[PDB]
Amino acid sequence: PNRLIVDEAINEDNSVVSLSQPKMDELQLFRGDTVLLKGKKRREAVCIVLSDDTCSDEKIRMNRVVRNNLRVRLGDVISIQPCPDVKYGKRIHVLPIDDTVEGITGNLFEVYLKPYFLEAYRPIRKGDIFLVRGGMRAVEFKVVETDPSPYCIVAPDTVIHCEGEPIKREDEEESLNEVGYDDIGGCRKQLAQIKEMVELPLRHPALFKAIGVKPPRGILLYGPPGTGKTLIARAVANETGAFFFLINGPEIMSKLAGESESNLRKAFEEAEKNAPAIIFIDELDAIAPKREKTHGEVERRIVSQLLTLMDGLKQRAHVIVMAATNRPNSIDPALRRFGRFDREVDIGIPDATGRLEILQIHTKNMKLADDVDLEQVANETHGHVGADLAALCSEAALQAIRKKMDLIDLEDETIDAEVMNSLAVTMDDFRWALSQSNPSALRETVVEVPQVTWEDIGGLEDVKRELQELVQYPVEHTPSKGVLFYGPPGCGKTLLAKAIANECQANFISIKGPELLTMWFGESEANVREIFDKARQAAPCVLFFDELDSIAKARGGNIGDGGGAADRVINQILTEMDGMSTKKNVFIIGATNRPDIIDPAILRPGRLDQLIYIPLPDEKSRVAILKANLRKSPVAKDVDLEFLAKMTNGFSGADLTEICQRACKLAIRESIESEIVPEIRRDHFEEAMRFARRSVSDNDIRKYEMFAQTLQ
Amino acid sequence: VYFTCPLTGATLRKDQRDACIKEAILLHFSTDPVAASIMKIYTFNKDQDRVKLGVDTIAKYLDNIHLHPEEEKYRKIKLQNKVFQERINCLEGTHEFFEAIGFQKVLLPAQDQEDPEEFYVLSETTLAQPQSLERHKEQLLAAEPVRAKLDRQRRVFQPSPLASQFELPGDFFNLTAEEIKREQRLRSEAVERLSVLRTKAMREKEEQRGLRKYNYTLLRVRLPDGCLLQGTF
Ligand SMILES: Nc1ncnc2c1ncn2[C@@H]1O[C@H](COP(=O)(O)OP(=O)(O)O)[C@@H](O)[C@H]1O
Ligand SMILES: Nc1ncnc2c1ncn2[C@@H]1O[C@H](COP(=O)(O)OP(=O)(O)O)[C@@H](O)[C@H]1O
Numbered sequence: 001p002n003r004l005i006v007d008e009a010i011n012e013d014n015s016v017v018s019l020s021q022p023k024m025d026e027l028q029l030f031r032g033d034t035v036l037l038k039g040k041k042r043r044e045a046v047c048i049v050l051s052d053d054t055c056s057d058e059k060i061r062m063n064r065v066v067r068n069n070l071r072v073r074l075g076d077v078i079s080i081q082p083c084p085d086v087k088y089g090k091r092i093h094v095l096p097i098d099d100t101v102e103g104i105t106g107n108l109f110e111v112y113l114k115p116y117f118l119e120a121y122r123p124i125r126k127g128d129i130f131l132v133r134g135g136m137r138a139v140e141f142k143v144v145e146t147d148p149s150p151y152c153i154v155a156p157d158t159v160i161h162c163e164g165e166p167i168k169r170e171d172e173e174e175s176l177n178e179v180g181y182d183d184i185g186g187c188r189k190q191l192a193q194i195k196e197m198v199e200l201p202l203r204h205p206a207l208f209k210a211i212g213v214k215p216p217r218g219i220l221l222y223g224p225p226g227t228g229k230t231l232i233a234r235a236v237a238n239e240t241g242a243f244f245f246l247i248n249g250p251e252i253m254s255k256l257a258g259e260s261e262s263n264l265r266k267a268f269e270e271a272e273k274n275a276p277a278i279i280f281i282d283e284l285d286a287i288a289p290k291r292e293k294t295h296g297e298v299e300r301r302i303v304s305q306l307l308t309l310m311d312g313l314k315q316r317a318h319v320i321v322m323a324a325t326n327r328p329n330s331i332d333p334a335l336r337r338f339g340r341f342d343r344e345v346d347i348g349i350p351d352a353t354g355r356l357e358i359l360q361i362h363t364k365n366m367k368l369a370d371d372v373d374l375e376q377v378a379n380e381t382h383g384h385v386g387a388d389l390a391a392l393c394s395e396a397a398l399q400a401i402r403k404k405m406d407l408i409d410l411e412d413e414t415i416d417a418e419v420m421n422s423l424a425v426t427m428d429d430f431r432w433a434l435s436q437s438n439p440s441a442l443r444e445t446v447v448e449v450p451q452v453t454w455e456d457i458g459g460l461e462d463v464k465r466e467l468q469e470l471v472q473y474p475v476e477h478t479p480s481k482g483v484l485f486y487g488p489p490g491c492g493k494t495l496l497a498k499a500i501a502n503e504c505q506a507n508f509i510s511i512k513g514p515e516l517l518t519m520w521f522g523e524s525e526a527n528v529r530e531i532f533d534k535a536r537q538a539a540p541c542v543l544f545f546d547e548l549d550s551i552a553k554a555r556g557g558n559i560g561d562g563g564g565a566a567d568r569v570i571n572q573i574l575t576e577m578d579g580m581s582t583k584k585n586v587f588i589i590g591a592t593n594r595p596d597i598i599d600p601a602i603l604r605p606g607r608l609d610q611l612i613y614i615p616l617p618d619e620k621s622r623v624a625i626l627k628a629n630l631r632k633s634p635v636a637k638d639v640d641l642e643f644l645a646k647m648t649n650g651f652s653g654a655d656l657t658e659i660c661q662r663a664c665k666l667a668i669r670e671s672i673e674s675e676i677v678p679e680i681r682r683d684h685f686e687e688a689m690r691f692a693r694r695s696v697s698d699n700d701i702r703k704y705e706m707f708a709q710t711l712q
Numbered sequence: 713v714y715f716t717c718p719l720t721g722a723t724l725r726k727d728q729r730d731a732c733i734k735e736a737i738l739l740h741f742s743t744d745p746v747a748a749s750i751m752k753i754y755t756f757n758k759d760q761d762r763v764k765l766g767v768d769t770i771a772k773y774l775d776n777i778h779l780h781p782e783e784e785k786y787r788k789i790k791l792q793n794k795v796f797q798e799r800i801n802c803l804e805g806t807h808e809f810f811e812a813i814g815f816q817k818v819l820l821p822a823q824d825q826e827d828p829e830e831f832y833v834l835s836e837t838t839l840a841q842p843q844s845l846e847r848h849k850e851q852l853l854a855a856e857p858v859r860a861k862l863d864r865q866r867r868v869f870q871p872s873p874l875a876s877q878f879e880l881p882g883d884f885f886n887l888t889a890e891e892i893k894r895e896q897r898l899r900s901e902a903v904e905r906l907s908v909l910r911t912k913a914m915r916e917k918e919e920q921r922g923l924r925k926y927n928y929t930l931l932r933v934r935l936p937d938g939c940l941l942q943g944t945f
Contacts, residue, residue, distance in 0.1 A: 003884070005895065021925070030932050038880055053922050056898075075895065077887060079880055084871035087938060189906045196899040204892060472911040503912045540909035585909035 002027065006076045008181060009063035010052060014130045015122040018061040019080070021051045029082045034123050034153065037062075038079040039070025046083065046123040046151040064180055065131055068173070074181075074239055075203045089152030091159040092124055093145035098166035099175055100139045106417035109162045112139055117154045125151035131176045133365045135420035136397060140176050142167050179234050185361050185386065186354020187228060190345050194219065194236055197343060198320055202240040202276045205318050216343050217313045218321040220284070220336070222328055223347035224441040226387025229324035232347075233280040242320075243277035245270060249286025257298050261305045268309045268316065276318035284323040285330040303332050310340040329530070346537035349385055349441050351448030352378050358386045362393040363425075371427040383439035383446065395433035400425040447538050450508040452498035458628050458653060459621025460492060463612055467500045470610060474582060481580065482588035483610035484548075484603065486595040487704050488696040490654025491614045493591040497544040500587070507541035509534060513550035519569045520551045528572035532580065539585040545573070548592040548602075557597070566599040574599075577607050595707050613708045616652055616696060619645055625653045629660040633667075634679035644685060650694035662688035713928050713944060715860030719751075726928075729860040737858065745812035746848050752805025754857040765799040766806055767852050774849045777834060778842050787839065788820060791830035813848040814838030862944060869940040 004023065011018060017037070029035060029049060037045045037060075045066055055061050060078065072078060094113055101108070112132040116122075124143055131140045144167070146152055154160070169175070184191060201208050201215040208215055221229040237244035245267055252260050264287075271277040281287060288303045313319055321341075325331055328344055335341045350358060356378035363374065381389060400423060408419045454464055473479060485493040494510075501508040511531065519525045535543040549557075551567045580586060590608055592598055602608050617625060622645035630641075648656060663684035670684075671677050715724045719736035737755055740748035757763050777786040789810070790796060800806045810832045811817070819828035838844055933941040 005891070030930065033932075036876060040885055058894075077885055077891075079884065081876060081878055083876040084869075084940065085873040085876055088936070189903070192899075192903050192906060196896075196903050199899075200892075200896055204887075207892065468911050468913075471909060472914060475908065475910045475914055504909055505915075506909055539907050585907050587909060 002081070003077050003079050004060035005058060006067060006072050006074055006078060007056065007059040007061050008074065009061050009066075010054060011050070011061075012063060012182070014063060014065040015120070016048045016050055017066060018050050018052050018055050020055040020057045020059070022057055023080075024049065024051055027080060027082060033082055033084060034086045035080055035082045036151075037066070037070055038081060039072045040076070041071050043069070043071055044125070045069040045128065046086065046125045048123060049080075064182060065129070065176060068176070069128055071172075073203070073241060075199065083151075086123065087148055087152055088155045089124065089146060089148050089158040091145075091147040091161060092143065092152075092154060093161045093163075094141045094143050095162060095164055096166045097129070097140050097142055097169055099169050100137070100177065101166045103414050104135070104137055104139070104417055104420070105414040106419075108139070108417060109160060111135060111417040111421045113141065113160055113162060117158070117160060119156055121153050121155055123151060124154050129173065129176070134367065135417055135423070136365050136367075137417075137420070138177050138365050174238075178238055179231060180239050181235050183361055184228060184231060184235055185358035186350035187232075187347055190347055191232060191235075193345055194232060198236055198278075199240055201318060201320070202242045202278075205276055209317060214314055216320070217339055218310060218323060218335075218341035218343070220323050220325060220328060220341045220344045221347055222325045222344065224326070224349060224385055224444055226385040226440055227347045227349065228386050229347055230280065230282060231386075233278060233322045233324075237278045237280075240276075242318075243271065243274040245274075245277060245279045247279060247281045247287070249281075249283035249288075252287050252302065253298070257301075260298060261301060264302065264305055265309055268312070268319070271319045272316040275316065277320075279319065279321045281321065281323040284325040284335070285327075288332050288335060290330075290332050303334070307334055307340070310335070344537075346534065348538070349383075349444060349446050351446075355381055355384065355389060358389045359393065362390055366393065366397060367421065367424045369424040369426045372425065372430060373427065377430055377434065380434060381439070383442035383444075384437070385439070385441045388437060388439055388441075392430070392433050392437050395436060396425050396429045399429045399432050403429075445509075445534075447507050447509050447534065447541070449505055450498040450502050452495055453502045454499045455631075456628055457492050457495045457499055458623075458625030459617040460496070460614065463496060463614065464499070466610075466612060467496060468503075471500060471504060471587060478606070479582055480609040481582050481586070482577070482590070482608040483612055484590040484592065484595070484598075484608045485612050485614055486592055486707060487614035488616055488652055488700060489593050490652035490695060491616060492653055493614055494544065494546060496614075497542055497589040497591070500589075501542040504540060504542075506587075507538040509538060509541055509543050511543070511545045513547035516545075516547065516550050516569050517554055520554065520567055523568065525568035525572045528569060528576060532573075532576035535586045535588075536580075536584055541586055543586055543588045545588070545590045548590045549594045549598055552594075552597050557594075565597060566601070570599050570602065574601055574607070596703075611711055613704065615704070616650065616701065619649075622648060622651065622656060625656045626660060629657050630680070633664060636679045636681045638682045639680065639685060640682065644689070647689065648692075648694070650696065650698070651692070652694070652696050655692060655695050659685065659688045659692045662691060714863040714865060716863055717860050719858065723863070724860055733858050733860060741808070741812075746809070746851065749805050749809035749812045750852050750855045751858050753803060753809060753852070754855050755859075756804040760857070762799065762802060766803045767855075769795060769799045770806065770809070771849050771853055774845050777839070778846065781839055781842060788831040788833045789815070791817075791832065809852065813845060864943045864945075867942045869942065870938075871940060 004019070009018070024030070027035075031050050032048055034046060035049050037047065039045065047062070047066060052061075060080065067073060070078060096108060112134060116132045124146060126143055126146045126149065128143045129140055130143075131138060133139075145161075152158075181191070197216050197219060221232065223229065234244055236242075247264070247267055252264050255263060267279065271279050288306050289299060291300050291303055294300070310321060313321065323335075323341060328336065336344075356375050359374045359378060368374075377392075381392065384392070404419075404423050410416060410419060457464070467483070470480065470483060485496065487493070498508055500506075509531070519527055532543070535541050548570070551569060552563075552565065555561045555563050555567070577588065580588075588608065590602070595611075603611070623641050626641045626644060644659070648659070651659075663680050666684040666687055667677075667680040713726045715726070715729055716722070717724055717729070717732045717736065719733060719740070722732055724732055733755060737748055737751040740751065753767060754760075754763055757766075773789050780786050791801065807817075814835050814837065815832035816835060818831055818833050820831050820833075822829050834845075929945050931943055931945055935941060
C-alpha cells in the first residue's frame with residue numbers, strides 16, 4: 001500500500017510527478033498537493049503530484065532529475081507520503097555544480113535560478129539537485145541551505161542566495177547530461193523491444209542465476225549511420241546501471257596480430273568482473289567481416305575469437321553483448337546462428353513525427369524565437385537521421401551566435417551567461433542551416449505512416465468498408481492476409497492502400513515498378529527477403545506491391561522473351577508470403593492493370609485471396625473526387641462541380657485531378673499577373689475542359705469487367 | 713457530495729435530490745396548486761426542449777380565449793389534438809396545471825363523430841376575469857426546473873507535521889514474484905500493442921474506457937498564513 005513502481009515521465013518538469021487518479025483518491029491528495037517520495041538508502045524528495053490519462057494505476061511517473069535525487073531507477077518501488085504541512089520558505093542557498101559551470105560566467109541567479117523559481121512555487125529540499133536549461137548550456141544546481149528544514153516551497157517572497165565556488169560533484173552523483181531514455185526521439189517501438197529483452201536480466205540478476213535458461217546473449221541493431229544505434233545501447237546501460245563497455249571494429253583491426261585478439265577477449269573478461277554489463281561492438285561488419293571475402297589471417301582469427309567469446313557468455317553471467325551494423329547481411333553469417341546474435345532490431349530512419357521530437361530534444365538548451373517552427377523543419381528534413389538533425393541544430397546555433405557575437409565582442413576565457421541567454425535562434429537561421437546541411441540517408445528507402453486518409457479518396461464507399469473489415473475482423477473476432485486490386489489506372493488503387501495504413505497508424509512500404517524491374521534486370525531478387533523482413537520489422541505495416549506485372553511487360557508483355565507469367569521477383573515474393581503468419585500484423589496489398597497475365601500462383605488460397613474491382617467512378621463519386629482535389633484551394637461560388645462531373649463521364653480520378661490542377665495553373669497565373677483572381681473561377685475549369693481527356697477507353701472497361709465476371 | 717433542497721431545507725446526497733424535490737412539489741399542491749403544477753412541469757420532465765414547447769402551446773391556448781372570451785370555440789382545449797398530444801400530453805404536471813388554473817376535464821360530443829372527446833373547458837368564474845389566467849401564463853413561462861443547491865461545505869484545516877513522519881520496513885524495496893512477473897508481462901504486452909495492425913474503431917474502443925469517472929470537484933487553497941481552505945463545486 002502507498003507504494004508504486006517508478007516509470008518514465010511524461011511531464012518533463014523537475015518538480016512534479018504524475019499518478020493515476022485512483023491512487024490519488026486512495027491517498028486523499030489533490031492535484032497540486034505537495035508529497036514526499038521515499039527512496040532507497042534512506043533518502044527522500046519533495047515534489048508536486050498531478051494526474052493524467054496514461055499513467056498505470058500501479059506506477060508513478062517521474063523524470064531523471066527526481067529519480068537521481070532518490071537514487072532509484074526505472075522498475076524500482078518508492079513510497080508516497082503526502083506532506084501538507086510544508087510551509088513557504090524564507091531563504092534558500094543554491095550553488096551550481098562545477099561539472100556544468102565551466103567556461104561560463106556572469107550572474108547565474110539572474111539567468112537561471114531567478115526565472116526558474118519565480119512564481120513557480122516549486123518544492124525544495126536540502127540536498128536536492130535540479131537542472132535549469134538556457135543559454136545553450138545545461139546547468140544543474142545543488143541545494144546547500146534552507147532556512148526552514150528539511151524542505152519548503154520557494155515562493156516569490158523567498159530569498160534566493162547564491163554565493164561561493166561551484167560544488168564538486170560527489171562520486172555517488174550522476175551527471176544529468178549523460179545520455180538516457182529522454183535523449184532518444186523516434187524509434188520508441190525499437191526501444192521498447194530492447195527493454196523487454198534487456199532490462200529484466202540486468203535489474204533482477206537473481207531471477208536468472210537460479211535457472212539453467214540464459215537470457216538473449218546478443219542483440220544486433222542495424223540501420224543507416226546516425227540513427228541512434230549507439231545511443232540506445234548507452235541509454236539502456238545508463239538507465240539500468242549496467243557497466244557499458246565500448247568496442248568498435250577499427251579499434252581492434254588497427255592493432256597488430258596477437259594484440260588485436262588480446263584486446264577483444266580482454267574486454268569480455270572486464271565485463272564479467274563488472275557484471276552486470278553490456279558490451280557494445282560498433283561496426284560489426286568491420287570487426288567481423290565475411291570470412292569468404294578476405295584472405296587475411298587477422299580477419300579470420302578475430303571472427304573465430306569473437307565466435308568463441310559469444311559462446312562463453314553462458315559462463316559470464318549477466319553480460320549482454322550488443323552489436324551495430326549497417327545490414328544483417330553484411331556480416332559473417334556464423335554470428336547469426338542460434339544463440340550469439342539471434343535477435344535483430346531495425347532502427348530505420350525517423351519519420352516526420354520522430355524528426356520533430358529529435359529536434360525538440362536537441363533544442364532543449366536553445367532559446368528559440370517566436371518565428372521558429374520545428375514541425376515545419378521536421379517536414380522539410382526528408383532523408384535526415386538524428387545525427388543530421390543534431391548537426392542542423394548546431395549549425396543554426398552557430399549562425400545565430402555569429403550574428404550577435406559581432407555585437408557582443410566578449411573575448412575572454414569564459415562567456416557571460418547574460419549574453420548567451422539573450423541569444424535567440426530565428427527561423428532564418430534554421431532555414432540557412434537546412435540549405436547547408438546534406439542528409440546522410442537520402443538514397444535509402446523511407447518507411448513511414450502515410451498522410452493519405454479516407455477523406456482524400458472520392459467514391460468507393462464499399463471498398464473502404466471492405467478494407468476496414470479485412471483488417472478489423474481478425475483483431476475484433478483462416479482470415480486472408482492480402483488483397484489484389486484490379487481495374488483501370490488512376491482510380492485510387494494506391495490511395496486505398498495508403499488510406500488503410502493511415503487510419504491504422506501503420507507504416508506504408510511502397511514497392512514500385514522500377515524497384516521490381518531493378519531486381520529482375522540486376523539478378524538481385526534476394527532483396528525481396530529484405531523487403532518482407534522490413535515489413536515484419538515495420539509492423540504494423542501495409543506492404544504494397546504496385547505494378548505487379550511491370551516485369552512481365554519488361555519481358556514483352558503481349559509478346560514475351562525467355563519468360564512469361566512468372567519471374568525471379570514474383571517467385572521470391574511467393575516464397576516469403578508462404579512463410580508469413582496472419583499474426584505478423586503485415587497486410588499485403590497488390591495492384592495491377594493487367595490481371596490476366598499475373599502468375600496465377602499469387603491468387604491461390606493462403607495468399608492474395610481477396611480481389612476487389614475498382615471501376616471508373618460514377619457521377620456522384622466524380623463530384624466527390626473534384627471536391628477532394630479542391631479541398632486545399634479557394635474555389636469561387638460560380639464553379640458547378642456537378643455540371644463538370646456530368647460531362648466527364650468516362651474520366652478516371654486521375655483525369656479529374658488533371659482538370660483541377662489545370663484550373664489551378666490558370667487561376668495562379670492570373671493572380672501572379674495581376675500582382676505584377678484570388679480564387680478559382682468557372683472560367684478556369686471551362687478552359688481546363690478543353691484539354692483534359694479520358695485516359696481509359698470503353699474497350700478497356702470491357703476487359704476489366706470480363707475479368708470481374710470470371711471471378712464473381 | 714451534499715445538497716440543500718430549496719423546498720424543504722433538508723440536507724441530501726447526489727442520489728436523493730430528485731426524490732425529496734419531487735415529493736415537496738407533490739405536497740405543495742395543498743398551498744398553491746398552480747405553483748406546484750408549474751414546478752412539476754419543469755422539474756419532473758428531463759427533456760427540457762419538450763417542456764419549452766409544452767408550456768408555449770399552453771400559453772397559446774390561454775391567449776386564444778383571452779382575445780375572444782365571448783366565443784365558446786376557444787373555451788375547450790382538445791386533448792386528442794395532434795399538437796396537444798405531442799407537446800403537452802407527453803409531459804408530467806401539464807394536466808394538473810390546467811385544473812389548477814380553472815379548467816375542468818369533460819367529455820363533449822365531436823362536431824363530426826358520435827364518440828365524445830376529451831376537452832379542458834374553462835369555467836365561467838375564471839373566464840369572467842382574464843387577468844388571473846394572464847398571471848398564471850407568465851408564472852409558467854418564467855419558471856425553471858427545481859434542483860438541490862450544492863453545499864460548498866466551507867472548511868479550513870491545519871496540517872499536522874506528525875503525518876509526514878514514517879519509517880519504511882527494511883524489506884519494503886524487495887519486489888515479489890507477482891510484481892516482477894506483472895511488470896515483464898506489461899513490457900511484452902506494450903511491445904505487442906505497438907506491433908498490432910488495427911483500425912481506428914478498435915483503437916477508440918480501448919482509449920474511450922478512461923473517459924467517464926467524475927462530475928464533481930473538491931478544491932483546496934493554500935493560504936500565506938498556513939491555513940488550508942477547502943470547498944465543493
Ligand atoms: N533516434 C535518435 N534520437 C535522438 N538523437 C539521436 C537519434 N539518433 C541519433 N541521434 C543523435 O545523433 C548523434 C548520434 O551519434 P553517435 O553517438 O555516433 O551515434 P550513432 O552514430 O550510432 O547514431 C547523437 O548526438 C544523438 O543525440
Ligand atoms: N478515387 C479517387 N479519388 C480522388 N482522387 C483520385 C482517385 N483516383 C485517382 N485519383 C487521383 O489520381 C492520382 C493518382 O492516383 P493513384 O492511386 O496514384 O493511381 P495508381 O494507383 O493507378 O498509381 C492521385 O493523385 C489522385 O489525385
